[PDB]
Amino acid sequence: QSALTQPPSVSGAPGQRVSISCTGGSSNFGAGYDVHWYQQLPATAPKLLIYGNNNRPSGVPDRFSGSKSGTSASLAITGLQAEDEGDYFCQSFDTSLSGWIFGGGTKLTVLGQPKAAPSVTLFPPSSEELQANKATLVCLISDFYPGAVTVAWKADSSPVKAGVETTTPSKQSNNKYAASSYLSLTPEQWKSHRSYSCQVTHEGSTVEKTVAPTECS
Amino acid sequence: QVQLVQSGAEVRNPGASVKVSCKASGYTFTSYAIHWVRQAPGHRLEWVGRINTDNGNTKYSQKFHGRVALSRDTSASTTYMDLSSLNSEDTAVYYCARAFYYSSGVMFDSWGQGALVTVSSAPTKAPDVFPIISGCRKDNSPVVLACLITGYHPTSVTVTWYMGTQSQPQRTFPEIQRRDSYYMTSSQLSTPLQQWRQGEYKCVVQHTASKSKKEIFRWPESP
Ligand code: NA
Ligand code: NA
């Protein structure tokens, strides 16, 4: 086969060991070419992790190791750390295609990290936005794990679903997740209610923050 | 240190062309070949081609059917990727990478930061940026600053916070597409403020697709 095949995903818990397979074919690994591996952390360029089947560049931890026999290669990761989450690609050269080839990428997930409750900060509309005849409430949600939350909005005590846009959570630098929710209102809605609230549910608890148009009066 | 630094994000209509650059530093430019590799959103790495930086010889992936050309300017230690007849499948981050020899082959040992090329017919628009604030300016309670970044196209924006000349920790949040097809996001200054003074902090919002940068350094009085 003139393509490299890797599993789409692998997972393990902190401190555990995982491996990522990559198989090729007669025209790449079978033609004598080595495998290289690249690590792509979220929102970053690929970085060389293993070259020439089993060699580590300077700085790469010895928890990463590689082997290859025939058309079968494998990247082993021992002592998994949350910092290891990302996409891992194998690479070789292929004679039938006359070019470099990459596997499809394996997403590594480190499950079972310590639970963390979200911090929630709610922002009212700015003076400038109101002068432009618009109003957006912004609910910023940080420092939570696992990376699933649900967000609910209320105007006074009534649930509001219209006008809500909520992001999918994204991992931040400290391995916890972040998300946001936006409630678009007219200036009349903002000014004519007693308050608005953002409620964030995570792992069996809900936390609620409230803002009111005359709070900083 | 070995470093490859690429040009910024670009937007192009279908059928247009794009030229991306990659400037090398920290080693002898002509001693190592340069490869280009792309990554369409959420997808796998795809080799584009190779240029010998000494003599200019090139090799390409058959997938591009003559639509890509690589070139080099040794006086500028720079390589260029020119991709023509752009289509929707060409929206991707384009990387350059240095080819390094070891005993039994070549590997890609150092990579540029990538340049996002977006193929779109929609107008490019710079963001509006609003200073937003949680808390008031009466209790021993934290004030939190953020910037709401809205109405821009395409993605993405880059945000940095300063106190004077000193960059400050921030919290980044995902971008989301609004019903009107423009994008919005927020950036929060990470540390709550105990003693707020005007003009001390600023948020700087870069949108390279519109060659624009906006800084907000005043949080006016609340309504
Ligand atoms: Na060989
Ligand atoms: Na200034």
Side-chain angles (χ1 to χ4, degrees), chain A residues 2-106 108-130 132-133 135-153 155-160 162-172 174-175 177-190 192-217, chain B residues 2-42 44-58 60-61 64-88 90-137 139-165 167-178 180-193 196-210 212-223:
Chain A
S2 59
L4 299 185
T5 299
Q6 329 173 218
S9 70
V10 296
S11 65
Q16 294 182 352
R17 178 176 57 84
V18 300
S19 59
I20 300 175
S21 48
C22 176
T23 61
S26 50
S27 57
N28 42 73
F29 293 159
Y33 292 96
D34 295 343
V35 67
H36 316 303
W37 293 88
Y38 302 82
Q39 178 187 59
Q40 186 172 35
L41 305 181
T44 68
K47 168 193 179 182
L48 179 66
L49 191 74
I50 294 288
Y51 67 96
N53 308 326
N54 56 5
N55 306 102
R56 275 178 298 114
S58 62
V60 169
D62 67 8
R63 300 184 299 103
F64 294 96
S65 63
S67 59
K68 184 175 78 69
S69 170
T71 54
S72 300
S74 184
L75 175 70
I77 309 175
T78 68
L80 271 179
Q81 301 186 14
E83 286 71 12
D84 300 332
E85 292 182 306
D87 298 308
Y88 291 80
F89 295 89
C90 57
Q91 184 206 38
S92 189
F93 187 84
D94 188 281
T95 59
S96 80
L97 295 183
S98 305
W100 292 84
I101 56 166
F102 294 89
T106 301
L108 170 61
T109 298
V110 174
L111 290 165
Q113 299 176 39
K115 309 294 191 71
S119 73
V120 177
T121 305
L122 181 57
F123 299 82
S126 61
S127 184
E128 183 178 358
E129 191 187 23
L130 291 164
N133 197 33
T136 307
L137 308 184
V138 182
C139 189
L140 300 183
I141 314 166
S142 295
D143 299 321
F144 58 97
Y145 185 91
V149 291
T150 63
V151 183
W153 289 88
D156 297 328
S157 60
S158 294
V160 181
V164 173
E165 295 267 27
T166 299
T167 65
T168 50
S170 297
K171 187 174 137 159
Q172 73 208 23
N174 54 44
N175 303 305
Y177 283 82
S180 51
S181 188
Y182 300 88
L183 176 61
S184 299
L185 300 172
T186 65
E188 291 88 356
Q189 292 175 309
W190 169 240
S192 68
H193 286 92
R194 169 181 72 262
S195 69
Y196 277 81
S197 301
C198 176
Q199 308 175 303
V200 180
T201 298
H202 181 259
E203 302 289 304
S205 67
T206 300
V207 64
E208 175 179 287
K209 297 293 167 76
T210 298
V211 291
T214 64
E215 208 135 61
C216 307
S217 228
Chain B
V2 171
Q3 185 157 20
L4 299 172
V5 180
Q6 294 183 250
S7 51
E10 308 280 354
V11 186
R12 294 293 185 270
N13 288 310
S17 62
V18 67
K19 195 167 192 179
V20 181
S21 65
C22 174
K23 192 168 165 50
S25 64
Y27 69 96
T28 301
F29 175 69
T30 55
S31 290
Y32 302 89
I34 292 288
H35 293 258
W36 285 75
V37 175
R38 72 175 186 184
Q39 190 170 37
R44 82 170 70 188
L45 298 171
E46 180 174 21
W47 184 66
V48 176
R50 173 196 194 262
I51 185 160
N52 179 308
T53 53
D54 191 10
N55 60 35
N57 293 340
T58 54
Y60 303 104
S61 169
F64 290 86
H65 299 285
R67 294 188 305 126
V68 66
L70 293 176
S71 59
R72 62 89 176 85
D73 181 340
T74 289
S75 76
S77 298
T78 296
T79 67
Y80 305 89
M81 179 207 65
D82 194 303
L83 181 59
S84 61
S85 302
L86 288 164
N87 58 60
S88 61
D90 296 321
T91 292
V93 175
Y94 290 79
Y95 295 102
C96 56
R98 185 176 78 164
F100 196 89
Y101 279 90
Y102 66 104
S103 288
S104 68
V106 163
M107 79 277 206
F108 296 4
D109 80 329
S110 189
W111 293 63
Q113 84 280 18
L116 178 63
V117 177
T118 297
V119 180
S120 172
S121 300
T124 295
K125 187 169 173 303
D128 295 335
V129 184
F130 301 110
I132 57 173
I133 185 172
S134 177
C136 307
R137 295 167 272 179
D139 184 17
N140 186 343
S141 216
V143 151
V144 178
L145 301 185
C147 283
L148 174 62
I149 304 158
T150 193
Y152 61 97
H153 191 277
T155 54
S156 308
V157 296
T158 281
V159 186
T160 55
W161 285 81
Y162 293 89
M163 191 207 315
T165 70
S167 180
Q168 301 296 300
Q170 68 171 307
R171 306 191 212 260
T172 74
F173 296 87
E175 302 175 87
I176 188 164
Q177 193 176 23
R178 303 156 46 91
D180 60 12
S181 299
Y182 300 101
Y183 289 87
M184 64 186 320
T185 193
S186 301
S187 173
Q188 180 197 314
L189 181 65
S190 285
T191 311
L193 302 186
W196 175 87
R197 87 178 289 118
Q198 190 72 275
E200 182 172 12
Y201 293 90
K202 70 178 180 184
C203 71
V204 179
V205 181
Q206 300 174 265
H207 188 234
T208 65
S210 62
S212 76
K213 182 188 300 175
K214 166 146 40 225
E215 306 180 1
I216 304 300
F217 59 92
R218 196 150 88 193
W219 269 248
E221 45 188 342
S222 28

